[PDB]
């Protein structure tokens, strides 16, 4: 029936259906066909489909995290030894209810996380997450004064994409390069970030230059922010500064070339430690330091 | 909801409102006691028969109380504390009226799995326990705190205003095995009088007293063993609002010299609210106490603030009646006493 | 006779004969025609031509520094109250001798500054200078082992230019982005930086992301280098982190745009403080901190 193909169908869609929430909705559809009455036939085939999904993954982390929460909810269903049928109907229904919860959470955060941006504050924003930009838009809806500084992130050129999406709103902007990002931290009140994942330790899984931002801000004593939707938690503990799950290059040094083809190769995803984050924002209240681990301990019961 | 229903039956609402606005009431400890006696009067006098209508009414009363006075966090916390004590006993009561409820631990995750009696008596006793808790904090501090400070160590102290910290210091000086030198920053525009009384009570007990001007803090930081904070209110992220003047700079001075920072507080003093901005939370002082003559005050726009904020980056321990906790853990102590809904009243 | 036109003629030339040394050679040619005997007729017209040169400058500092040294040498000529003809002949000759001194200094440095690169050390290089690359080439001539990491500098895509010039030598390389430059400082032994100017204080005048490199290296405790030819000293003291002589923008924030035209604007030249430099290398011996200032005090006699 396929799950990778269902995820590939979301091309011109996105924005509303968040990348993990669309993968979770795809997991529920695959579950509801071949009877969730059996726990040997279904769960094993769900595990095989997640393994097939991980094997097809090039540079995504959040899809593995979202699977875990689904699994957890499924197991928790019939924890009351309830009827093998009303528990099943509640499990199938919690697929569309899971996607509907992404809207309700965004409604919560955009009213909570506008408080952090005070009267007339210049912001240097890095990365693009649907939660952080929704704060930025619904603060403009709240009629609050804020300036914006764009970071030239280099994955699939994200800075230019961010700049254009800020133009459509009506907020004054200018391009700042990630090389010169050190020379900006004096005319900037606060530094904001959108994460691809949040660590078990309390650190962050992010883009092509975020640790560098974290350290410079720690030097300048200027605050460093992480805002996300509460589903990007993996049981992952990157022990060192340069160790992450990869399908491509972990720093490759190429031979002598004349035509110039083999060059680009650098760490596209980088980790930053727990100390560098001043504040973290999700729908699960306002919490930063040891909070992430407590969430993971509560979920995994281990 | 307005105070139109509670006027002849309850009069003490408006006298507390008057005590806050004109600042007739002083010190978070006292504000808490008054709100306790308010909720004592609310349950003893009112007639409700229904439970959910009652709780939401209490929520609106607390909402109006915090809007009446923003620096009364001890007011806001005490109500929130009883609210949660109520909510647990209601959830226990609903399980018996309907008829695993014990998975592993006492967690959170309210986004995952879905859902006549002596309840009023429990509400009464719940207030009584809160009073007794506020009555005795020092006993719970001294057993954790007087284990960390050594002989021949010099202690620098901003905020001499706290009754809690001074009494912690006197119990340690009572121990003849422990010797320490006390440096006290003055805190000129506000703390001065309190700092002088602090220096008097240390001499009364015969402890090596050293009065320090707010300029000289740097000129001593090489010699300082430890730093102690007399905080008013503690927060989610760890940070504190303290009882006025000359703390933030001292903490900045300590961190640069890598000198340890201590904080003495209570759980009622601890708040489940988040300080997203210091700009809103901090209260500003009266510039009258700085400079005389009003014709030069046209051109002399002087800045003075009472309450001082410390970010969590500096302090390391919050010794309470329960125990010593790190700022990266204090949120859990808070959630153990106040619920997630009981924040936005 | 023009001086700006003479400097514009160097298009396909450059290299070995440096940009400031070509401006100094242009100063000598302008001097030698209209009689250097008169100190009233000539020095005022030399000052006007330097003022016209500064007004034509878009983004260069070293040309202003090179004029100063010339002036100084001219004044020092007749310090011995010598024949007003033999001193003049020595002044005109010290123009071609000045450019010949750029050869001799490069011969000195490339034998002195190869000692810093030890047995098998991974280098991260940023900000291309003729002195640092001459160290890199003449160490390969010395048959020593060294690995190289390319930084993606963004002035006019300099990183790609640097990468191609490293390919023409026979040394293994790979592209590292200035955003991710924080994620590299653990596998890199030493960080080398070539300067556009060295401050009176002991700091550095450099490109689109060098301060950021300096701070990160200070955090990682990994050494930070400055290698140059000894002519890039101005009596300049940038008081703050973001204050420099400019003909363009000092951080501009533009209005709401839809066509997308006004964006790029960021600090193209950035300063770093004296503390971040571990070591400095010039032909004037091996010296780093207050050495620069001593030189400047020695020149200016003030």
Short mmCIF file of N, CA and C in Angstrom, two decimals, chain B residues 191-269:
data_model
loop_
_atom_site.label_atom_id
_atom_site.label_comp_id
_atom_site.label_asym_id
_atom_site.label_seq_id
_atom_site.Cartn_x
_atom_site.Cartn_y
_atom_site.Cartn_z
N UNK B 191 17.71 49.98 49.97
CA UNK B 191 18.13 49.02 51.00
C UNK B 191 18.90 49.60 52.18
N UNK B 192 19.42 50.82 52.03
CA UNK B 192 20.27 51.47 53.03
C UNK B 192 19.89 51.24 54.49
N UNK B 193 18.65 51.60 54.84
CA UNK B 193 18.12 51.47 56.20
C UNK B 193 18.10 50.01 56.66
N UNK B 194 17.69 49.12 55.76
CA UNK B 194 17.62 47.69 56.02
C UNK B 194 19.00 47.06 56.13
N UNK B 195 19.94 47.56 55.33
CA UNK B 195 21.33 47.12 55.33
C UNK B 195 22.05 47.49 56.63
N UNK B 196 21.68 48.65 57.17
CA UNK B 196 22.23 49.15 58.43
C UNK B 196 21.70 48.36 59.63
N UNK B 197 20.43 47.95 59.57
CA UNK B 197 19.81 47.08 60.58
C UNK B 197 20.39 45.66 60.51
N UNK B 198 20.75 45.24 59.30
CA UNK B 198 21.40 43.96 59.03
C UNK B 198 22.79 43.91 59.67
N UNK B 199 23.54 44.99 59.51
CA UNK B 199 24.87 45.13 60.10
C UNK B 199 24.83 45.23 61.63
N UNK B 200 23.75 45.79 62.16
CA UNK B 200 23.52 45.89 63.61
C UNK B 200 23.23 44.53 64.26
N UNK B 201 22.40 43.72 63.61
CA UNK B 201 22.04 42.39 64.10
C UNK B 201 23.17 41.36 64.00
N UNK B 202 24.10 41.58 63.07
CA UNK B 202 25.31 40.76 62.95
C UNK B 202 26.32 41.06 64.06
N UNK B 203 26.45 42.34 64.40
CA UNK B 203 27.29 42.79 65.52
C UNK B 203 26.70 42.36 66.86
N UNK B 204 25.36 42.38 66.97
CA UNK B 204 24.60 41.90 68.14
C UNK B 204 24.91 40.44 68.49
N UNK B 205 25.13 39.63 67.46
CA UNK B 205 25.49 38.22 67.61
C UNK B 205 27.01 38.00 67.58
N UNK B 206 27.75 39.08 67.35
CA UNK B 206 29.22 39.09 67.24
C UNK B 206 29.74 38.23 66.07
N UNK B 207 29.40 38.68 64.86
CA UNK B 207 29.89 38.11 63.60
C UNK B 207 30.64 39.24 62.88
N UNK B 208 31.82 38.93 62.32
CA UNK B 208 32.69 39.93 61.66
C UNK B 208 31.98 40.65 60.51
N UNK B 209 31.49 41.85 60.83
CA UNK B 209 30.66 42.66 59.94
C UNK B 209 31.52 43.60 59.09
N UNK B 210 31.21 43.65 57.79
CA UNK B 210 31.86 44.56 56.85
C UNK B 210 30.89 45.23 55.90
N UNK B 211 30.71 46.54 56.09
CA UNK B 211 29.79 47.32 55.27
C UNK B 211 30.49 47.83 54.03
N UNK B 212 29.88 47.52 52.89
CA UNK B 212 30.48 47.77 51.59
C UNK B 212 29.64 48.74 50.77
N UNK B 213 30.27 49.79 50.21
CA UNK B 213 29.60 50.60 49.19
C UNK B 213 29.43 49.87 47.88
N UNK B 214 28.40 50.21 47.13
CA UNK B 214 28.05 49.53 45.88
C UNK B 214 29.05 49.66 44.75
N UNK B 215 30.02 50.54 44.94
CA UNK B 215 31.13 50.72 44.01
C UNK B 215 32.25 49.73 44.26
N UNK B 216 32.44 49.38 45.53
CA UNK B 216 33.59 48.59 45.98
C UNK B 216 33.48 47.06 45.80
N UNK B 217 32.40 46.62 45.16
CA UNK B 217 32.11 45.18 45.01
C UNK B 217 33.21 44.49 44.22
N UNK B 218 33.64 45.14 43.13
CA UNK B 218 34.74 44.64 42.29
C UNK B 218 36.05 44.58 43.05
N UNK B 219 36.29 45.60 43.87
CA UNK B 219 37.52 45.74 44.65
C UNK B 219 37.71 44.72 45.75
N UNK B 220 36.79 43.75 45.82
CA UNK B 220 36.82 42.71 46.83
C UNK B 220 36.63 41.30 46.27
N UNK B 221 36.16 41.21 45.02
CA UNK B 221 35.71 39.94 44.42
C UNK B 221 36.75 38.83 44.32
N UNK B 222 38.02 39.23 44.33
CA UNK B 222 39.14 38.30 44.38
C UNK B 222 39.23 37.57 45.72
N UNK B 223 38.75 38.22 46.78
CA UNK B 223 38.81 37.72 48.16
C UNK B 223 37.53 37.01 48.62
N UNK B 224 36.47 37.14 47.84
CA UNK B 224 35.15 36.60 48.19
C UNK B 224 35.09 35.08 48.00
N UNK B 225 34.61 34.39 49.02
CA UNK B 225 34.36 32.95 48.98
C UNK B 225 33.06 32.59 48.29
N UNK B 226 31.96 33.15 48.79
CA UNK B 226 30.60 32.85 48.31
C UNK B 226 29.69 34.07 48.26
N UNK B 227 28.65 33.99 47.42
CA UNK B 227 27.63 35.03 47.29
C UNK B 227 26.26 34.45 47.66
N UNK B 228 25.50 35.17 48.48
CA UNK B 228 24.15 34.74 48.93
C UNK B 228 23.10 35.79 48.56
N UNK B 229 21.98 35.33 48.01
CA UNK B 229 20.86 36.19 47.57
C UNK B 229 19.65 36.06 48.50
N UNK B 230 19.12 37.22 48.91
CA UNK B 230 17.86 37.30 49.64
C UNK B 230 16.72 37.59 48.69
N UNK B 231 16.32 36.56 47.94
CA UNK B 231 15.29 36.69 46.89
C UNK B 231 13.87 36.86 47.42
N UNK B 232 13.05 37.53 46.62
CA UNK B 232 11.62 37.69 46.87
C UNK B 232 10.82 36.62 46.14
N UNK B 233 11.10 36.46 44.84
CA UNK B 233 10.37 35.55 43.97
C UNK B 233 11.29 34.78 43.02
N UNK B 234 11.08 33.47 42.93
CA UNK B 234 11.85 32.57 42.07
C UNK B 234 10.96 32.06 40.93
N UNK B 235 11.57 31.81 39.77
CA UNK B 235 10.84 31.54 38.53
C UNK B 235 11.14 30.17 37.90
N UNK B 236 10.47 29.91 36.77
CA UNK B 236 10.55 28.65 36.03
C UNK B 236 11.95 28.38 35.49
N UNK B 237 12.49 29.37 34.76
CA UNK B 237 13.82 29.26 34.16
C UNK B 237 14.95 29.19 35.20
N UNK B 238 14.63 29.56 36.44
CA UNK B 238 15.58 29.55 37.55
C UNK B 238 15.70 30.90 38.19
N UNK B 239 15.76 31.94 37.35
CA UNK B 239 15.98 33.33 37.77
C UNK B 239 15.11 33.89 38.88
N UNK B 240 15.57 34.97 39.50
CA UNK B 240 14.93 35.56 40.68
C UNK B 240 14.65 37.05 40.57
N UNK B 241 13.54 37.48 41.15
CA UNK B 241 13.31 38.87 41.52
C UNK B 241 13.62 38.99 43.00
N UNK B 242 14.53 39.90 43.32
CA UNK B 242 14.99 40.09 44.68
C UNK B 242 14.48 41.38 45.31
N UNK B 243 14.55 41.44 46.64
CA UNK B 243 14.09 42.60 47.41
C UNK B 243 15.05 43.79 47.27
N UNK B 244 15.02 44.39 46.08
CA UNK B 244 15.64 45.69 45.75
C UNK B 244 17.15 45.83 45.69
N UNK B 245 17.60 46.53 44.64
CA UNK B 245 18.91 47.21 44.53
C UNK B 245 20.19 46.41 44.66
N UNK B 246 21.08 46.62 43.68
CA UNK B 246 22.46 46.14 43.72
C UNK B 246 22.64 44.66 43.93
N UNK B 247 22.09 43.88 43.00
CA UNK B 247 22.20 42.43 43.02
C UNK B 247 22.75 41.94 41.70
N UNK B 248 22.14 42.43 40.62
CA UNK B 248 22.47 42.05 39.25
C UNK B 248 23.92 42.25 38.90
N UNK B 249 24.46 43.41 39.29
CA UNK B 249 25.86 43.74 39.07
C UNK B 249 26.78 42.85 39.90
N UNK B 250 26.38 42.58 41.14
CA UNK B 250 27.12 41.72 42.08
C UNK B 250 27.21 40.28 41.56
N UNK B 251 26.10 39.80 41.00
CA UNK B 251 26.05 38.49 40.36
C UNK B 251 26.89 38.41 39.10
N UNK B 252 26.89 39.50 38.34
CA UNK B 252 27.76 39.64 37.17
C UNK B 252 29.22 39.68 37.59
N UNK B 253 29.48 40.32 38.72
CA UNK B 253 30.83 40.40 39.31
C UNK B 253 31.32 39.06 39.81
N UNK B 254 30.40 38.28 40.34
CA UNK B 254 30.70 36.94 40.86
C UNK B 254 31.02 35.95 39.75
N UNK B 255 30.24 35.99 38.67
CA UNK B 255 30.37 35.07 37.55
C UNK B 255 31.68 35.27 36.79
N UNK B 256 32.11 36.52 36.68
CA UNK B 256 33.38 36.86 36.05
C UNK B 256 34.56 36.38 36.87
N UNK B 257 34.42 36.46 38.19
CA UNK B 257 35.42 35.92 39.12
C UNK B 257 35.19 34.44 39.48
N UNK B 258 34.18 33.84 38.85
CA UNK B 258 33.77 32.44 39.07
C UNK B 258 33.50 32.08 40.55
N UNK B 259 32.96 33.06 41.28
CA UNK B 259 32.61 32.90 42.69
C UNK B 259 31.18 32.32 42.77
N UNK B 260 30.98 31.25 43.58
CA UNK B 260 29.68 30.60 43.72
C UNK B 260 28.56 31.50 44.24
N UNK B 261 27.35 31.29 43.72
CA UNK B 261 26.16 32.08 44.09
C UNK B 261 25.09 31.18 44.71
N UNK B 262 24.65 31.56 45.90
CA UNK B 262 23.63 30.84 46.69
C UNK B 262 22.33 31.63 46.75
N UNK B 263 21.22 30.91 46.85
CA UNK B 263 19.89 31.53 46.99
C UNK B 263 19.03 30.79 48.01
N UNK B 264 18.43 31.57 48.91
CA UNK B 264 17.59 31.06 49.99
C UNK B 264 16.15 31.52 49.72
N UNK B 265 15.23 30.56 49.63
CA UNK B 265 13.83 30.82 49.23
C UNK B 265 12.84 29.80 49.81
N UNK B 266 11.56 30.03 49.58
CA UNK B 266 10.47 29.09 49.91
C UNK B 266 9.71 28.69 48.66
N UNK B 267 8.95 27.61 48.77
CA UNK B 267 8.11 27.12 47.67
C UNK B 267 6.90 28.00 47.39
N UNK B 268 6.41 28.70 48.42
CA UNK B 268 5.35 29.70 48.25
C UNK B 268 5.91 30.95 47.57
N UNK B 269 7.19 31.23 47.83
CA UNK B 269 7.93 32.29 47.14
C UNK B 269 8.21 31.92 45.70
#
